[PDB]
């Protein structure tokens, strides 16, 4: 994992580790760059499951302490462990007991998958899947003593941007 | 359906005809007993899973006006449609916008499942699990407007039996 | 399947059994409305699958001595052998060695999926899926010696409500 | 079920409801006739999963009191309800500690399954096939306290026959 | 794998590598070390499958040369080749006709599965699993000619414990 | 992947690591030896999956550029990413828009797959499997705008080879 690119023309055009595929049993992994491989880092108490494909942009670094992570919604659910070349929708801010956290949201590049190019930004993403993705965050992790998440509402392509800019600079020092 | 008995030995030893499998997409189906055939009711909002089988016991009628309803915990999810002979652990009792709701909890006969033979009251069952389907049922129609749904707290066999008792009585008017 | 309603206000607001579930394994089942089972009919030689679920609309009589069959497109695939109340977005016009061919597209009713309640009619039905839809319909045949499908094209609502009231009216005699 | 022709044309042209589909995890399902439905009959002690598809020819009645029963091969496994046009390859004959027992081994007609059209007989059936299923009858109710089954050894299609022929005859009285 | 930590804290706190996923088509996988791969193996003839999760201790060299291995209770099957922190419940002694065999029973940190935390010793596994697990290792080999298994019984967290103690130095040299 | 033995003893014992298991969603993954991860390559706009698993020779470079790919028949889909050893039964000749493309068909060791091991060339591949083959390749890119597949026929273990031993020879320059 800590020797592939984070993109190809940062930050538009960026690379996604998946960790989690959308729809997949309600265990969470976790990518140890370490080591090449997926953790498993916890059965969610709710066993509810990540509506949409869920990773990481490598070798980034967010103000959380860990890479920038991404949403990345597909027809069909992505391999666990595969990379994928995606582009940014927006973003989904929310706080969480231990400080900010924010999950870009993307698609492939179009030429990967044609089935999403007419997402342009987060206001394309169909409400109910918009509605979906607030609902998971605001209470998957319910089942967690001590854990909450507040979602605090959705930004576009450029706040999006930044995120991937800055987790970038940060992860060089 | 409306043929398949309500249980050799009522209220302690029913039948329980599968809707909605254990972990199954999140399709909620209907029996049509007038049919004979599963409907589909509901595309559910927040994409949640049942965490265990749900059905109904066969010629009953609660006060909602809909039969007995039950999940039946199992270790593979069974086959929406099929009937299952069980016994009760006891009940949910909730509270949504409608009025009183109840639902009981199941396992099937120890001669079907000698996996749930162990299990003879609600609190056999892991504590994980009934969380679980308190949060389920507090969060699963959180995105259908208008609707909501209150967990109570447990009861006993007494308590689901007496439910059993009296939605046979009045199916029978 | 043969006392299922065609429909609770036809032809707008009518009913489908579903025979095959979208990307399914490549069997094709027929509703055997005589038994009230479905009937394994053939293994596809191309071993195809559905892109999207397909079934028919009980009590209704097409020219070709068949019910009006009618592609669903759903979230996720449903169960062989429900039934959904859908709403028809237009049809694929198809001639094969037999003759004409329609298969209607249809949606479920509003309130059963509100996912699917943005799509008005047949144009808005993802370009990649039109075409996916086009291309299974002439290719899936191609392994069965004797047979041949071609694609004319699409038509809108007014044509599939026609094949909807004219298959209602035959059923009857 | 109880309303399926036995078949077209008796004794080599039958009809198999299939009640359990090769490889569908470890629960066994009994048609109940009487019903039209499926009956959740054990979870399975070894938790060993049909090697083929599992069913029964409708009105017969074998000497034990039950249905012939079948074993069906196909490239897919077919769906729990289904009913499928079959002919005979032979059978395995197999005794338990309740009496003799035979299974019949099946494949779909041959406008059905062309794939399976190359088998002509029993013999045709790949060796590690026929050995997978005589384990799997041996070893399967392992752990259901009181019961064996010995396998005997195959028979060929005019056993199977025979057995279909009387089978058919008993259901009549 | 072959820089994965044995443990946070031998032998107590020991990590697993997942080959084989509970309930996974039977095809045996081995990973290799030397390549970071897992490797197809066999596939096995009597196509049982294994009840639970099975993986190895990495850096661990048991006296037949291959890495102690892992049976992982989990409530979800896990991803192939994913690494799980695992506590010892014993191990299960066998003979093969190879020498010694032994398997430790294992499940997650209680962080990672709460599921589990109720589960202190190999006596806390239900009776139907471990019957399950013996049979399993009994017969799944049956049709691998020249081999064989034989089960000598259970063992606890001390003998577990041991095991990992000496796999872990043997692997040093 | 660039460090995994193109075989053990070539060009008739040789590894394939495995890309697309047969029949899983549609989508490609190419497998990036720099990276050691599979790739997310193309969402098929025909939605066509591969009926047998694909994947390639590793240090391996065919004439186009690519390692030398190969399908690779099995009785149950194997593991994206894992490796077999394998044995060839012949090719599939074909040309696109870019140039010649050839397709070796393998299967698993006997071994490894003792199933397989009545395949001895590539016409014991049954007819409907191959007729099913060719079609896939014919049609699989029907959708990708300004892509052509046309399929030439098969050649048997001789040819194979060739491409194998060049393969191996133009990779080490
Ligand atoms: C949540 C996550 C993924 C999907 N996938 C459906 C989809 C995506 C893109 C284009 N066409 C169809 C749906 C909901
Ligand atoms: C929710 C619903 C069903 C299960 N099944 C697991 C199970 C049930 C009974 C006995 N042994 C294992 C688990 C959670
Ligand atoms: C719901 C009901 C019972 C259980 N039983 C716990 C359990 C542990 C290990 C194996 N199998 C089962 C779990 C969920
Ligand atoms: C073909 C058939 C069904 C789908 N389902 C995806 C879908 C449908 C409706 C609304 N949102 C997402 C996609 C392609
Ligand atoms: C068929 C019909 C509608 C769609 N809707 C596109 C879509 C994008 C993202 C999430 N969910 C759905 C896709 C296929
Ligand atoms: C056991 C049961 C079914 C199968 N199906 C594979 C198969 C059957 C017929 C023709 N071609 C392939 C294999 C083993
Ligand atoms: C049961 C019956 C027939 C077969 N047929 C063998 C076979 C080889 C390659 C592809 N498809 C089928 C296998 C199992
Ligand atoms: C065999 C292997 C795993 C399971 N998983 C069921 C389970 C495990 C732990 C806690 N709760 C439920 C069951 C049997
Ligand atoms: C296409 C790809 C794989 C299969 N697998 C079935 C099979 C293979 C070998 C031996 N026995 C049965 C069938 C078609």
Redesign the pocket.
């Known amino acids: 994992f800590s020797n592939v690119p984070a993109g190809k023309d940062l930050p538009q055009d960026f690379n996604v580790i998946i960790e989690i595929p959308a729809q997949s049993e309600p265990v969470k992994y976790e990518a140890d760059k370490a080591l090449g491989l997926l953790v498993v880092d916890r059965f969610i108490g709710t066993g509810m499951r990540y509506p949409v494909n869920y990773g990481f942009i490598p070798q980034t670094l967010s103000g959380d302490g860990d890479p920038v992570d991404v949403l990345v919604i597909t027809?069909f659910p992505l391999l666990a462990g595969s990379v994928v070349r995606a582009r940014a929708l927006g973003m989904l801010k929310m706080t969480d007991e231990s400080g900010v956290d924010a999950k870009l949201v993307a698609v492939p590049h179009d030429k990967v998958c044609p089935?999403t190019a007419n997402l342009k930004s987060i206001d394309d993403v169909?409400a109910?899947?918009k509605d979906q993705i607030k609902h998971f965050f605001e209470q998957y992790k319910a089942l967690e003593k001590g854990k909450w998440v507040k979602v605090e509402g959705w930004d576009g392509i450029d706040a999006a941007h930044k995120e991937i800019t800055d987790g970038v600079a940060n992860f060089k020092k």
């Open positions: 027809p089935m169909p109910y899947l």
